């Protein structure tokens, strides 16, 4: 059932990307209005695994006042907020990016840029959309800006060169000669990309390892005969494998991925009475062994210029809110927290890697962060059992 990786994405009528819509008929329009009088910012600061950023604009004929700086955005991009210098995006250090400019639709013009995770540096580029020319009822129009920060992938990127083509754009690879009996077993750390190159792969490639249990990549991205396996951020067992197969050169080259080290010390609180849990938490305070008249409060403080670790919470009661997808606010000395915010907006860092588990009745919720937090933040989660409550407060610098 060998099919090309590009053919393993099926078909979807949606977009599945970073849509930054700016069109008069759209919700986030730019024509003058009395409800809103401020510009629109579409900020995307994160690493892209062959991901797409789209910049929908109105047609020139329909809205001649609308202008875009640079006019050929995603082909030439601004480099400074204040200097306003436009540079070709081919000289920005980008690797294997591409651009598409679709004008067939009679309502809007689409401008997509596809970006690869192989960049050797942290790139930043803007694209401004000026609509101040359009004035209606003596009211000036609003502007907009798309800011894109392509962060260099903060982990080692690996490559299997199993195709006849030469990939000079990225030189760290294993190539065909490193295979023993057409079987490769690579030991990777957490968050370690494996960009395998193969024209023909298995239909269920990187989804079912040869025995040794099985684990799931957070992403399996197929693009242009490239299969990207993103190594999981947190693992619990050692006997773990994932298998892929190729028929290149009339040989069934097998690839086996397996992490080697397990069970980081999770910076969290262990409210469960279980002392034999497969997880290892920094703190510990039983909630079932404390009496009803006691409020449990534990704090996890983290301080590092760069983060690679996690924050977790294991408890046998119910967890409020649905941590760690949503969290509370720092409401201390006033009342018990009752407002719900998203963790992604609470910490102001993208691509946070969540995790959930149910060890018997013990609900365990974790989120791991890689990178640098802009500003120091704090948040709380509550675990309630019967009438007793435990407040875990994370303070991340």
């Amino acid at each position: 059932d060998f099919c090309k990786p590009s053919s393993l994405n099926s078909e979807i009528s949606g977009f599945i990307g970073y849509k930054c819509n700016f069109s008069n008929e759209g919700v986030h329009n730019l024509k003058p209005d009395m409800r809103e009088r401020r510009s629109i910012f579409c900020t995307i600061h994160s690493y892209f695994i062959y991901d797409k950023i789209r910049l929908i604009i109105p047609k020139k004929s329909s809205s001649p006042e609308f202008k875009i700086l640079p006019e050929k955005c995603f082909q030439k991009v601004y480099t400074d907020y204040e200097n306003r210098v436009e540079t070709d995006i081919s000289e920005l250090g980008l690797i294997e990016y591409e651009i598409e400019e679709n004008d067939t639709n009679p309502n809007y013009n689409e401008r997509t840029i596809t970006i690869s995770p192989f960049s050797p540096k942290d790139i930043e580029f803007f694209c401004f959309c000026d609509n101040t020319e359009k004035v209606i009822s003596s009211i000036e129009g609003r502007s907009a800006m798309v800011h894109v920060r392509v962060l260099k992938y903060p982990h080692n990127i690996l490559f299997t060169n199993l195709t006849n083509d030469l990939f000079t754009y990225l030189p760290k690879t294993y190539n065909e000669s490193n295979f023993v009996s057409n079987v490769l077993e690579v030991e990777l750390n957490d968050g370690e990309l494996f960009v395998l190159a193969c024209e023909l792969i298995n239909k269920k490639c990187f989804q079912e390892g040869k025995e040794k249990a099985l684990y799931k990549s957070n992403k399996i991205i197929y693009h242009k005969n490239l299969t990207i396996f993103k190594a999981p951020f947190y693992v619990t067992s050692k006997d773990v494998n994932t298998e892929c197969t190729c028929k290149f050169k009339n040989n069934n080259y097998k690839i086996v991925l397996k992490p080697k080290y397990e069970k980081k010390v999770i910076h969290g609180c262990n409210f469960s009475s279980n002392v034999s849990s497969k997880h290892t938490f920094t703190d510990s305070l039983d909630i079932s062994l404390v009496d009803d008249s006691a409020h449990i409060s534990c704090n996890v403080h983290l301080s590092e210029p760069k983060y690679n670790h996690l924050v977790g919470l294991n408890c046998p009661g119910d967890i409020i809110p649905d941590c760690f997808f949503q969290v509370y606010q720092p409401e201390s000395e006033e009342l018990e927290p009752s407002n719900i915010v998203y963790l992604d907006s609470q910490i102001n860092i993208g691509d946070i890697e969540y995790y959930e588990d149910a060890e018997g009745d013990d609900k365990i919720k974790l989120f791991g962060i890689v990178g640098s937090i802009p500003k120091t933040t704090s948040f709380t989660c509550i675990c309630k059992k019967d009438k007793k409550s435990a407040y875990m407060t994370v303070t991340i610098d």
Epitope: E11, K60, I95, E98, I99, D103, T104
Partner: antibody, heavy 129, light 108 residues
């Protein structure tokens, strides 16, 4: 509705000079590279000429069969394209279209692909005796 | 440049029955194909781009599929207005201005 209309075709004796004109209604032709195709005797359209965007210099390209005679001109101010024909041979009798590259896509190596969306009705040009 | 081959040149099918047209490309083009439909007496129009996406104002019966070197345009429940000639052009690598041999759909 955005569309293209062309004129200038007709009957002309061999060895003369002709001028096909194309115009765009409903949009501007300055952002698209005009590609003049031709179709003869119910065949597939055959590339005759290409004139590129102002941003890409303004280079002109032609097929081998017509290289050195046909000359493409553009006027973004009036958004009109012209194909000037010198010393037409007998084989130039065909219907000519002026397509625009509605879909474009590039990469790190420069321009990579064009796909044409809007076609004019096409001007018939006949040369014989 | 690349050359696309279409076989058969003429396709015969009764109205209300799907017909399949195939376009084979000598080199690798990935998923950058364009299918154009030309009814007699007027210019061809862009029917499908990207080998799977339908152009605006196109009924859903025109389905596109394929990738790499082989592509297919399936016309499902063919009506009386879907008789024309179809051209496949590759626009992945320079130059894009190259159409196919043309395939005709007739009434059985």
């Amino acid at each position: 509705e955005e569309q293209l209309v062309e004129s200038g075709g007709g009957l002309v004796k061999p060895g003369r000079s002709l001028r096909l004109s194309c115009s765009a209604s409903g949009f501007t032709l300055g952002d698209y590279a005009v590609t003049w195709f031709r179709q003869a005797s119910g065949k597939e359209p055959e590339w005759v000429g290409v004139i590129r965007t102002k941003d890409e210099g303004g280079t002109t390209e032609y097929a081998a069969s017509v290289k050195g005679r046909f000359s493409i001109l553009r006027d973004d101010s009036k958004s009109i394209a012209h194909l000037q024909m010198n010393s037409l041979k007998i084989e130039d009798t065909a219907v000519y279209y002026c397509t625009r590259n509605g879909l474009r896509w590039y990469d790190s190596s420069g321009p990579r692909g064009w796909a044409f969306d809007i076609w004019g009705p096409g001007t018939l040009v006949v040369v014989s005796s | 440049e690349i050359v696309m081959t279409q076989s058969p040149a003429t396709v015969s099918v009764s109205p209300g029955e799907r017909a399949t047209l195939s376009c084979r490309t000598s080199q690798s083009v990935s998923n950058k194909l364009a299918w154009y439909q030309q009814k007699p007496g007027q210019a061809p129009r862009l029917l499908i781009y990207g080998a799977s996406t339908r152009a605006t104002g196109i009924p859903a019966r025109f389905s596109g599929s394929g990738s790499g070197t082989q592509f297919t345009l399936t016309i499902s429940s063919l009506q009386s207005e879907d008789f024309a000639v179809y051209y496949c052009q590759q626009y992945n690598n320079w130059p894009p201005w190259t159409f196919g041999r043309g395939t005709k759909v007739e009434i059985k």
